[model samples]
Target: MNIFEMLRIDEGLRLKIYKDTEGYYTIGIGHLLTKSPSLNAAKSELDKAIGRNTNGVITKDEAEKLFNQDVDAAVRGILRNAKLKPVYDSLDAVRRAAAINMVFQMGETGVAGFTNSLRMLQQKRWDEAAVNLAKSRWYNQTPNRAKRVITTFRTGTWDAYK
Candidate 1:
């Protein structure tokens, strides 16, 4: 039911850099290097994590650590959005996880674009919020993960766990 557990299922670990489904240069637990603070800075940290700068390889333990950092960044990113902060605060823990997951995958700006969905969630119109999530390009790009996240949005439970 935790964020790491959910993301571990949704975004399986990769020890080396590879192209994601959307063709972004990614590594570790779905960390998009292209969208990171700086490609070199991110790579440097990844290198540091493994104790040597070789290829783009990362250990599970180090990757997990990076995952935690990314999750923290994602949470901060969500709270940084003025519109999202209130909606996030108004939500329960499960729903809050849903918000963090979305921000983790997409960026804060991407999640902020879910105007109607946020409104529906704030209004407690669960089904409507789910419907709004389903309407996104993110849903089309990652159906399986989206299915679980959308289901969580509606039921306010760990759909990924199920």
Candidate 2:
């Protein structure tokens, strides 16, 4: 499956603003609205995307567009990281997707902090990579999702997905 489809399963789309597990205001498939510089900026951007004022609701098509943009940015951010570029390029589609999913759940900077994991992945040491992922606070915070990502990295297959 494509990144969007996989993320759709993981993120679970929503048309209205809601609080994420961390209590941050979020919307449209895990888009962290509170991260915007200002609420008006988020609203303005959403308005532009939907081609009108949102009145706190968005269509599925608009949500999909938002998800695509978020995924694109995450992919670009991961690719731009000097330490991750070669590792990302060396992996197969399934493994590459694991990296993207990490960057999607955590920001690029957050994923970049997994230096040992990245090193193991670059060396194609799948077991060490999975172990490294399991050792992280990210894994502690969201075990099920992290387990799926870790499994994807370890196996280099889509079998972890439903």
Candidate 3:
């Protein structure tokens, strides 16, 4: 199924998910994790996050519960993966969350192929990581989405882009 259908999300929720990730809303790790739940829960959480972020379109309590639950599930899954075990074991909460967010945006398979980006990240090369990430085939092919993601990543703020 296409992403929206797969997630059972309405356009508003879909738009919010895209906005939340700052656009690189390609079917990546975060989206995958968010959608990993039973379709009903996924949709419910998405609705809540969108609503919460949009000021009462969804309730704050519901949004928090839904986000936390989904994040927990995604983290558990990562910990269970042999390849991801070492990384999961080593990360601080913030780093782990960021990694999860990246995975949420990129998916495990896609993230796995980011050799240069990974190396740059390991070396603390923020600029190189951003540049390399933007240069990947994935980014090159999705200009609109890339623009949003890059802006969010670089500025640490979210802005709507048509």
Highest-scoring model, lDDT: 1
Winner by TM-score? 2
lDDT of 3 by residue, 7-67 (tens): 2221123222332333322121233224333544445555554553342133444434454
lDDT for each of the candidates?
Answer: 0.85, 0.84, 0.47
RMSD of 2: 2.2
Which ten residues in a row are the worst by lDDT in model 1?
33-42
RMSD of each: 2.9, 2.2, 10.0
Predict model 1's lDDT versus the native: 0.85
In order of appearance, the predictions have TM-scores of 0.89, 0.90, 0.45
Residue-level lDDT of model 2, residues 1-162, one tens digit each, is 767777887889899876676666677898876665465766765676668889668988888877888899999998899987888999999889999999988898899899999999999999988998899899998898889889999998778786
Kindly provide the TM-score of model 3 when superposed on the true structure, using C-alpha atoms.
Answer: 0.45
| Candidate 2 ranges with C-alpha deviation above 4 Å | 36-45, 48-51
Residue range 1-162, candidate 1, lDDT tens digits? 688888888889898877777876678888876645455765775576557884677778878877999999999988888989999999999989989989999889999999999999999999989988899899998999899989888998885577
What C-alpha lDDT does candidate 3 achieve relative to the native structure?
0.47
The CA lDDT at 114 in model 3 is 71
